[PDB]
């Protein structure tokens, strides 16, 4: 299963000019495009090797759309400031994410937006109705219902976007369609005279989805398991670890289990 996603953010700054627009694009867990309004020369640039041979005018179509959604965002922040009867001196944020989630057949699409960190309006799972978070978002729902806005979004989600997502998988098939299994090792740190720490490591895996669990004599353990956020390594892979505290002299009774796409079957580690 593969996906194409986009994330757009706009931050207003009263008294400091006009808002700041940024947008990023992704194929599954691999970014490939970006646009910064505060850049020295704002234009869409490639971040992945499989979009560098696409043509300078596809790169102007893309750029001209980024500059369009930035102007559209400027108006929305003004309307949203009026919807909530908000003062003129405060900064606000407007987030927007959407994508297409295709056996290779199209499955689902999504389109959601947020105002100042909270949910605002979202395209429903049928891609025909909306869900407004409050009364202010009902003003938007009334507008996009009379404009038949949902039908235009569905045309892109189930049409143009599954076309280009299918195309990106062919041009970068050597990296996009190749899972990398995690590389694991276990450490040990004595805390006191009767306490120690066991850390199960998972490095260099792709995609980012992974599960880590500690077990004492075959029973799941989460009362004493520390879990960090899956973090990027900076080279296209990800890392993660999980730590459990144990009585010293009992470390041999603990096992770490790893679940990942690239493994033939789950792992089972000991110190």
């Amino acid at each position: 299963s593969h996906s194409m996603r986009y994330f757009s953010t706009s931050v207003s700054r009263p008294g400091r000019g006009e808002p700041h627009f940024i947008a990023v694009g992704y194929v599954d867990d691999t970014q490939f495009v970006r646009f910064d309004s505060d850049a020295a020369s704002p234009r869409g640039e490639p971040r992945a090797p499989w979009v560098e041979q696409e043509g300078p005018e596809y790169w102007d179509r893309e750029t001209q759309k980024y500059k369009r959604q930035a102007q559209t965002d400027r108006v929305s922040l003004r309307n949203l400031r009026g919807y909530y009867n908000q003062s003129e001196a405060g900064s606000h944020t407007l987030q927007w994410m959407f994508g297409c989630d295709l056996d290779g057949r199209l499955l689902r699409g999504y389109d959601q937006s947020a105002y100042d960190g909270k949910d605002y309006i979202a395209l429903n799972e049928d891609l025909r109705s909306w869900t407004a978070a409050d009364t202010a978002a009902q003003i938007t729902q009334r507008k996009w219902e009379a404009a038949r806005e949902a039908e235009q979004r569905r045309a892109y989600l189930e049409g143009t976007c599954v076309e280009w997502l299918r195309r990106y998988l062919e041009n970068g098939k050597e990296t996009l369609q190749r899972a990398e299994h995690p590389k694991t090792h276990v450490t040990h740190h004595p805390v006191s005279d009767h306490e120690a720490t066991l850390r199960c490591w998972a490095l260099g895996f792709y995609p980012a989805e992974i599960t880590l669990t500690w077990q004492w004599d075959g029973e799941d353990q989460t009362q004493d398991t520390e879990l960090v956020e899956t973090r990027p390594a900076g080279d296209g892979t990800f890392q993660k670890w999980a730590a459990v505290v144990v009585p010293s002299g009992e470390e041999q009774r603990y096992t770490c289990h790893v679940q990942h796409e690239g493994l033939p079957e789950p792992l089972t580690l000991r110190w």
Partner: peptide, 8 residues
């Protein structure tokens, strides 16, 4: 491929 929509 990006897509720009309407105003909120």
């Amino acid at each position: 491929l990006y897509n720009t929509v309407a105003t909120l």
